[model samples]
Target chain A: SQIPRLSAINDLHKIWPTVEEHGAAIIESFLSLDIVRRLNEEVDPFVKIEPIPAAKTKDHPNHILSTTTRLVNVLAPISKAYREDVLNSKVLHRICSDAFHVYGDYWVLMGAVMELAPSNPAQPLHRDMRFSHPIVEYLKPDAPATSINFLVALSPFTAENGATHVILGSHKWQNLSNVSMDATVRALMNPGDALLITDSTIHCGGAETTGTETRRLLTITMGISQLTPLESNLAVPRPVIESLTPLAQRLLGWASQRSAAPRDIGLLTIRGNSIEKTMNLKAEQPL
Target chain B: SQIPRLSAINDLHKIWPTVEEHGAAIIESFLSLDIVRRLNEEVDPFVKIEPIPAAKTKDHPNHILSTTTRLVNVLAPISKAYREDVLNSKVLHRICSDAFHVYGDYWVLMGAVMELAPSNPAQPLHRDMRFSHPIVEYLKPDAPATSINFLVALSPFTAENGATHVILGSHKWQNLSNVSMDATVRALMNPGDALLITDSTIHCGGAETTGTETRRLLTITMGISQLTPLESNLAVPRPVIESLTPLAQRLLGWASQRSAAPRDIGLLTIRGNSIEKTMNLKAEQPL
Candidate 1:
């Protein structure tokens, strides 16, 4: 779940250019059917794919299909093409800027997948990060200063089949226990339209009708702090000290300095062994 | 309608003796047939008094009779015998010490007529005093305080006859926009049995049997400085005032201060030219 964190406004300004430029780049790649097809092939095995159901639950009668998958980060190595496609694209800049400025957190790419199904009923509106009982106590009006969301559409969204709905300025009202389903509007777009949103925005997939075709969308989210990745993204089964990309490795804290090997770069000096050695020792030792 | 007012432990002690002694002196008087007949006669002209009805409304299915009087203070004077009966009752003394010691700012007297009827289906359960709204914001844990309720049965009460029911300690819960009918429990009592309760208690009347038998109970509530009374016993109508006995006149704030003002009184001191002069003024005139 993307919880917003506070950050300096200046830090946010510094990343604006990169995010804007990256957003455009991703939009271009998203429009390519070939690219989408290639990514879909790679994603199919890992995702527990399902077509959007024709009927909704008894409590709700709306049109929409929901698909779920796990271990997205684990496929990062095998889908290097998709990664490169995103990295070189100008959309990364906007995504990064949005992640930092709007959410005030360093985000790590989690997962990318698509929802392909004929729209029938609308999805019941709900928040992504459900607050646990204890967490609810601290979810005050002044707490949680940041949020992050990412979206990449693979098909055209229409009002008839539930389009994505996003509530404007709802993030500011997060102190309320329940989000009203009515306070939402459609986010219509063509294939490859990318979206970088903050957690403050209340949003959900609208009901889709099975009118002639399926609605497919890909989504990715990032967080400020490096917690456990919801899905493993690296190619290796176990994270290796040297195998991680510079960016991925840095996020994992594997690039830290160590006492056994001191290095001086420019005016600053570093000491303390890499995190990998320390983590290995901890894992092997009894206490 | 007796909103509670506060008094120190010492002041309560000084008055406790007189109140206890007076209450013992009036117990037999409360049950006398003459007093009952007089109450029935006095109340009949003011309201279309009848046994509480049986049929329930959308909000309160078993509610009994509807009341015509706007305020209890208006009837306080005509109900002198019942007032004296309460002041002299033995049960009052037994309860007074606890009421004053554990929960200050409250006292009770019963046997007088009660005004209760089925609530309209559209009517919401709102607080008696609207001014108390802002106080809820400051009433957090560690600073918790609430009101108390005291009900006395004037007649035999049964579950089928719309007896008063209450939810214990519900006052501490915040954001009470709606009242639940199910939370209520019928309070059964014999005549003269006094109930000691706190304001944190949420209460409502039970349903009465359909035909003619209606439950009649007198309820008085007390609270800390957090609450204000809806009616003041000291204020009464002119005709009722003229009929009160000397003792009742004092309690009704009709007698001169030199005659029978409360001992160890802590409230705002009463100052006026004369009771006759004040009573002659129209309703719009300030007292």
Candidate 2:
């Protein structure tokens, strides 16, 4: 159940097979401390730390947890630190690109900030890919995963605070119901460290026993292309899109892309023209 | 401007290159007379011949045409003729499979019965791929289209009635605004004949000048896999799904598929199990 830890992202060649074999990995200082500070400063005003409000209806919403963990979704449009420093990080691009190299295309599933406070209960160990599992018939060793989750620590993640608990190599199991929580290990990390797990891996947030602990994490989900994204990339403002790097703009669906084998085109304008023309961003270069 | 016509589907070898170069083709007698008659019988009770009712709001709905074109959408579950005979047509599977072979996977975009009455006005020239065009950046001659449309004649398609109008080879055009209607040719066919077009081709429904003409067309749109389908495949009942052929079930999304290259999986159950398991259909074979 132990997750392999990398001192830095410099050894990216080892990251894929490590996560592929071990189910998860930690890269220390994947995000700079300056960016981590900026992200907290950027997101602080948008969230309220309290018990998630109950629904007006009789049935409770899915997000209502046993413990109160403040969540701020749709981070790309709001945080400059998120879009540039984190989302467009070269190390992230290299790993994700390699993970989904079989498909030749990928998109952001979601980007959000999760902050857990004291006395937060341990979340049930679950596979992040469960929702998408049945729909895709993956042939193991070929398409082992359809998505990956990247959790970056905004604050020092300690066992006493709420570090994530992961059952490494759990992705290789065929029987899901019989998995044991006793075999789990915490993803302990300093601020700026990132823990990435395959969609099939069993993982969850740990309990914060220490009253003084305040753990913040940035969750970024990336999946193979063609799957409907959990959060709409179009939610971002055009001005904000214009402000992003060319790679960032493309990743956010600002530019069009044709998958290598499918030959299907996507992220076009309403009229089937380049989205840049409609958004008034820089025109795409002629082929 | 005349579309190429094949006497039978036996000469399927000629179909791909014809559409690849000409943008459209007519496979005469693609459906047997028995199937055509049954489709009409199955669909007769579901539609009405009258001016489309206005929407509750001030704005008209998108389906409201200048002339009344009765539409019955989501044909897979409701009609056996649609699901078994038409949708499962080996010819359709062969063509769509070939069109999207670059990707190695495809799905039904939508299935509907369209009935055009007398005096129906000609639809303006447009490209079917328009909505998805801007987002997908395509390299020429590689990924020519992301989807294809198959229009089968339930009733005889004649020049006097609303036979579909198409511009041959219009798919290769860069400027959409400047195209002329004079170059367009109507697709005339006998009952059971089918007209297929690439997504980028310029096409529209022609006018029904003859008062006696009542054109009934079975419209089926097939697209490269990973695209969000217009109709929900899950809308079909389990009993109905159990009765379908394996190919038909797969097309209707009752079975799971992982697109090649992208290696993304799709059409799974809510709990990430095989939909067949959830629906209690036949168990999938072990690899």
Candidate 3:
């Protein structure tokens, strides 16, 4: 039997114009409140929680939120539906495919929130590439590891409220050590607008001037294969996972080749099969 | 130089009486908020920042905070001062020795947390023994191991809030698949309360009912010559850790054993030293 090609039905350009173009388009939707709230609600219970230290000298603000290990299983079902509706209507798949062309199978969605008063130093001009591991660096040229980072704005993203800043096409730039050249491009967007870009693109969280207001955003980072996930999926329970649909199960690794099998049964089968085959073989087994 | 005698400190009754009487004593102080805040501020900006996840259900009322993998060099000065206060206090040392009956040329202060909230499920009950590795069945009592654990409450510990629950004298019951019984005694105390227990003790975080309340505690697990720490001390930066006193530096493995001529370090060097030496080092040539 021939293996099914999941990619045949979709084309990159149909969903997104170009990798760089999709970056801007997606960011527009990401900086929106509707999507941000949904993501925040979905991720609240399971993500690893840690305390963000209160900013020193009042220049920085406290960030409170948990990080989910993998959203493919959690958000795959929702994203798939959204893709069929809004994403399909828009050019998301093309941009996503372009990203996959550069990076391989594994990707990550890192979600966070600034729950307390806004502070300027909440984010600084930086590159997501700095966090990339050595293994990622090894696969860079061949795989061309690109990250379509989308910031789903929970509240309105504005310059005054610490909006996200993006440097256009900086993903293709070679030198990133100099921080001064990377300027903040105020990521102004209405609710549901996404801020998307590649991992190499220079960006920073906008510092919020108002202590009363918050700039909440859900960041979904899409990358190609060859990269390892930040969180290990070993801990997710089996029963809860098996109930998901084929697509959701596959994203959760339940339907994939790596899915867990009945270990005790498998061992028993090995023993039982050996005895059954020996008994059935008769004279041929005597040799 | 005369080496300290390796004779057993066998004074359990003497030590237990004190810890039981006082409820808990602040074995180590200066692990104060000022020190923790300073470290958080002065650390290099390149260090990755991760938000703490909420351990409770998102629907729950309280908001808490936490972080991990703090740079030890930045925390060493504070830990040293704390350890000195514990070592010099006869009452504190006796209570600790009684719990585990283990001693060594040096003791290192490892992890530190400012406040651990109790609003979530008490961390799944487990022993620190698993971290020691090479865990063996209790049937084979010959495994080389010895360590003492101390818990000092930084804040008041109450039954209403989460207090640490410990299985008294459970240390000897090794190799059992599930040593945890539903029955456990709460280590209740006021601020500065200290509890000393052995490696054999089974303990876990207790549930806290009050939403906004927290259980703040500091813990140190000290080991004998037979056991070793999980990480290297010398690997930490020197200039940053120099603020620690001689004892703290030695305990934290911050002090170099290298002499100017041959750089012959102390045999008690926890950083570059190995388990083999720890188990077999003679008094004269400890290195």
Candidate 4:
């Protein structure tokens, strides 16, 4: 199969096609309503680039403002917004499950805002997995393909306004510099559309945003718990993490404890084994 | 763990990490002793470009003398030696198999006989897939590659005797013209040594052999079995075709019948998809 060309649209045919096809997908406006509510309620006021320092750099020099990565930290622990709108998604789990050894390691997925200025210079092209040079990483297939990015649009993406541009098939390329610029394709999309990009695809924020409309996008990511998360802004408060369902909690990651002897179940451990799946001690002991 | 970096190497751990690093690899000597004997005694003498018209001139003014490619037709089907030494090697298959899918259908660029006579002009640096523009061909992972060639030296290859000169990491570049000669390296080789070169690598036959020794090479390769074999020499006469082992026959294209799987039907919309049709009917039975 030719590198299965990832295209825009929502369907159940493949696992996180968005995640792997450099994670770009013309997803239906599945999250628009939900995304809007979460942003306005608790996360918006703190969206400015202070506190979380790195958010200032993710955008081009022209971006008037960008949000710190942990936008999810502000959502109430009692809110099921993450569980319903994002984390507990079968499509998401399917994508992550495709790589992990079934709950092998649970890790938090991070979220942030990228509000590109109308005149943004293109962000330099690069893979989300900054630690990746996949031609070599593939040799270690059993390892996690860390730093996958899924960008959910809060506003319509247009080429003139600097939509995401990605070099298709770049994941397999060794020299990103040798890549042809003509090969770059814009993931032009509607508000609420989302793009999932592999750690290897060379992508950058679009350049020369010509429209008066600023592009508002939400960025989220996943990584194997064995490895540290790529976005430091991913640190969600325990209350916010506790608000999610058990599955969501697991996805957010569990506190690890070691045991001597253990029996292995399908991605689960029993007895002296290292039970990576943590019980909800949060409900027992008040946070 | 981080993405494993692919660097220069010739090892069994992976097929020419070099080939995929930039789509080319200079490899260690891997052919069986039987390969050396049979190829020399039976396959070499008949390699002259004369019997096969136009078997010459696959080059610029530099390659004054080259050899014919219809190797199997010349070797005879009853001659299973060619089958064992070259066609049956798992390393060739493993290396090629990795690319054809993700990169695209790999046309087999199998060739032979650099046969650089004394004072042979240097062949111009070029890709085996001269037919490729590369940009469009790469857009689809299932289309024609071009080819991935593994050339086996039949004589000790030396800079003095016109060793192959290749621009390292040039296979993935946008403009072959912009390539740097500074990156070039002579494929110095021993008799029985092999080199894996992607169809896209910028390479040329070496110039100015001083030792009066003719540089002879035997090239056997496996690419995307789905792509066409470039040389008419790829044709196998009937008696020879049926004479090979079932596996050898398969590798030699008797069974490359339709697209490897029906799943390919959708992908083969491009004429290149149709590259594997049963076109090599040297002597088919009256059916």
Model 4 residue B241 distance off true place after TM-score fit, in angstroms: 1.8
Give the CA lDDT, 0 to 100, for residue B4 in model 2: 94
Task: Estimate the TM-score for candidate 4.
Answer: 0.40
Off by over 4 Å in 4: A1-287, B1-10, B48-79, B103-111, B131-146, B232-235, B257-262, B265-287
How high a TM-score does candidate 1 get? 0.35
Q: In model 3, what is the error at residue B276, expressed in angstroms? A: 27
* Tens digit of per-residue lDDT, candidate 4, span A1-287: 11223323346456354445443444555465665567545444444432432333322111222321223231223234554466666655666666444324434434555565557677667665322111213332232354466677777777887788877667666655676556778877766566767666677777644646667776766654433222221224555555455556445433331111121111111111212222322522234
Measured against the true structure, the TM-scores of the candidates, in listed sequence, are 0.35, 0.54, 0.35, 0.40
Q: lDDT per prediction?
A: 0.39, 0.69, 0.40, 0.48
Taking the tens digit of each residue's C-alpha lDDT, what string does model 1 give over A1-287?
A: 12221122223343333333221112333335676667767766655432222222211111223342122233344554455454334445444545444222243424446554564456565444332111112233443323355566767777776676765556556465556666565666666655545444566777766556666666665543311122322223242324444444433322331111111110000111223333331221211
lDDT of 2 by residue, A215-243 (tens): 88998888765554444444345567767
- Number of clashing residue pairs in every model? 60, 23, 43, 22
> What are the per-residue Cα lDDT tens digits for candidate 4 across B1-287?
11122222345556645466655555665665557667777655554532432223212111222332123222333235565546656666666566554532333333344445567666667765333111112222323333567777777878787777777667667655676556678777777767777666777777655846776777654554323232322224456654454455545434422223212211111111111232332332321
lDDT of 3 by residue, A78-107 (tens): 332232233222334445555554222323
lDDT of 1: 0.39
Quick one: ranking by lDDT, best first? 2, 4, 3, 1
DockQ order of candidates, top first: 2, 3, 4, 1
